[PDB]
């Protein structure tokens, strides 16, 4: 009919334009829709191809717009999102890719804000590993081939670490623990040598931030909290004793209840 | 461009075969029950009436945990046993929505009726026995099995002010893990759980549900824990061994040691 | 037949006439009230009571 594309028109136009109250009101609209679907296929299709566009165009504002859009799609307790999820997951994870092709500086933290999007990933999989069990295996193999190799930029490694971080506890316990020390040596090579790849320098710096201030609590459970310098010896120096210091902070946060 | 409509993994034939499987799991006739059990345990190459089957089997486990019905429990747990012995259908990938249903069957509140908690102890026995059958295959990898279930039952045993069904299921699951497991665990828990015994025994004013429950639980776990220290210690000085086991084990520990000496004399 | 032969699954008939058009019309009502709420809080708004 008509109102289909009317609704589609103004909610896409509010999705693109930066009218900030209308922005957030469209988001609460999508979050509070009884029976908004059948617009969902065109909706997601728009999300996918606009993602590809803004990959080519590198407009971070549209990226966080689309991510909030996906967040809103997620928060319908009516939207059986299932059959269409295969369009979102590229549109999610490609946002966890791109080839560092924005301007540098603040975008790093915006890369961190794309890790907000990585939160969505877990907020996908909790509701959608229900498969002939496919989804978690898929994404984790993807992050694995991301995480292991060299010829891997800091966008890629950073966001892969972020997605595994949002996957949670034993992902970090089993998967990040092994080549923790080797990638720490990768950053130690990024450390202490050349200077003027400061994209890569501050990239690896807030990589270290991800590693420490996401990977502390699993060792806080596992490794008992004596022996800070030995834990540095047990986990390649650099994370210690800020590993143990953040572990003391996490034990304090646990005992705060 | 509207795609062709889907087709399931099933056939109509084998999903009706699956419906026969399910309603024989309901089945009152024990011939139909055993037929189902053999059909589970010896249909290799089935593999494709796998997880969907087991998945809302586990969902039915949760819903009937809410419904608190022992018959559905025993049917599902013998069903999982027959699932465990069908040798081709490898468990690995599909493990991780099954084992928590087993442990939810272990933990607590299987309360159809308060005079009828009796069968639930045997349910927990059978369940921990199933866990023992699980644990010998999967902890080579990631140690969800041994480390997580042991620390689960560890901190579960630490959990004070919980119903003794939790205590029984925990200690029974640790008992099923093996000789050296109990050798580690009930070395301090010998006299610490004896302190729990004589907190229960010669304890409250009146709660005879909990009294009779915890009492037979402590008796069961006492003489079931007994072959460890029987294999560990020689059966001398039962008066000293009761002092070595906080008294309440004596002489039921000594009677079980006499039974163990009789079992050795049977050899 | 439970091992040897197989079958085919179409699995979605859903042809309940009055129920179908109930679904469609209810969904139309949904999109009505959705766009109403959207441009309601979007544009120039005047009320019926005070501050609705």
From Swiss-Prot, chain B:
Function of the protein: The TFIID basal transcription factor complex plays a major role in the initiation of RNA polymerase II (Pol II)-dependent transcription. TFIID recognizes and binds promoters with or without a TATA box via its subunit TBP, a TATA-box-binding protein, and promotes assembly of the pre-initiation complex (PIC). The TFIID complex consists of TBP and TBP-associated factors (TAFs), including TAF1, TAF2, TAF3, TAF4, TAF5, TAF6, TAF7, TAF8, TAF9, TAF10, TAF11, TAF12 and TAF13. The TFIID complex structure can be divided into 3 modules TFIID-A, TFIID-B, and TFIID-C.
Family: Belongs to the TAF6 family.
Protein name: Transcription initiation factor TFIID subunit 6
Coiled-coil segments on the chain, per record: none
Disease linkage: Alazami-Yuan syndrome: An autosomal recessive syndrome reminiscent of Cornelia de Lange syndrome and characterized by delayed psychomotor development with intellectual disability, hypotonia, microcephaly, short stature, poor speech, and dysmorphic features.
Shown segment, full-protein numbering: 207 to 473 of 677
Complex formation: Component of the TFIID basal transcription factor complex, composed of TATA-box-binding protein TBP, and a number of TBP-associated factors (TAFs), including TAF1, TAF2, TAF3, TAF4, TAF5, TAF6, TAF7, TAF8, TAF9, TAF10, TAF11, TAF12 and TAF13. Interacts directly with TBP, TAF1/TAFII250, TAF9/TAFII31 and TAF12/TAFII20. The TAF6/TAFII70-TAF9/TAFII31 heterodimer forms an octamer complex with the TAF4B/TFII105-TAF12/TFIID20 heterodimer.
Entry's localization field: Nucleus
Species lineage: Eukaryota, Metazoa, Chordata, Craniata, Vertebrata
Modified residues (Phosphotyrosine): 47
Phosphoserine modifications at: 58
Modified residues (Phosphothreonine): 42
UniProtKB/Swiss-Prot annotation, chain C:
Associated clinical condition: Neurodevelopmental disorder with severe motor impairment, absent language, cerebral hypomyelination, and brain atrophy: An autosomal recessive disorder with onset soon after birth or in early infancy. Affected individuals do not show developmental progress, are unable to sit or walk, do not acquire speech, have poor visual fixation, and show poor overall growth associated with feeding problems. Additional variable features include seizures, spasticity, and joint contractures. Brain imaging shows hypomyelination, thin corpus callosum, and cerebral and cerebellar atrophy.
Subcellular location: Nucleus; Cytoplasm
Expression induction or repression: Induced with triglyceride accumulation.
Encoding gene (name): TAF8
Protein name: Transcription initiation factor TFIID subunit 8
Top-rank lineage group of the source organism: Eukaryota
Residues of the full protein shown: 172 to 207 of 310
Other facts: 'Taube nuss' means 'empty nut' in German.
The species this protein was found in: Homo sapiens (Human)
Function text: The TFIID basal transcription factor complex plays a major role in the initiation of RNA polymerase II (Pol II)-dependent transcription. TFIID recognizes and binds promoters with or without a TATA box via its subunit TBP, a TATA-box-binding protein, and promotes assembly of the pre-initiation complex (PIC). The TFIID complex consists of TBP and TBP-associated factors (TAFs), including TAF1, TAF2, TAF3, TAF4, TAF5, TAF6, TAF7, TAF8, TAF9, TAF10, TAF11, TAF12 and TAF13. The TFIID complex structure can be divided into 3 modules TFIID-A, TFIID-B, and TFIID-C.
Self-association state and partner proteins as the record states: Component of the TFIID basal transcription factor complex, composed of TATA-box-binding protein TBP, and a number of TBP-associated factors (TAFs), including TAF1, TAF2, TAF3, TAF4, TAF5, TAF6, TAF7, TAF8, TAF9, TAF10, TAF11, TAF12 and TAF13. Interacts with TBP, TAF1, TAF6, TAF10, TAF11 and TAF13. Component also of a small TAF complex (SMAT) containing TAF8, TAF10 and SUPT7L. Forms a heterodimer with TAF10. Interaction with TAF10 is mediated mainly via its histone fold domain while interaction with SUPT7L is via its C-terminal region.
Family: Belongs to the TAF8 family.
Comment text on domains: Ectopic expression of the histone fold domain acts as a dominant-negative mutant resulting in differentiation inhibition.
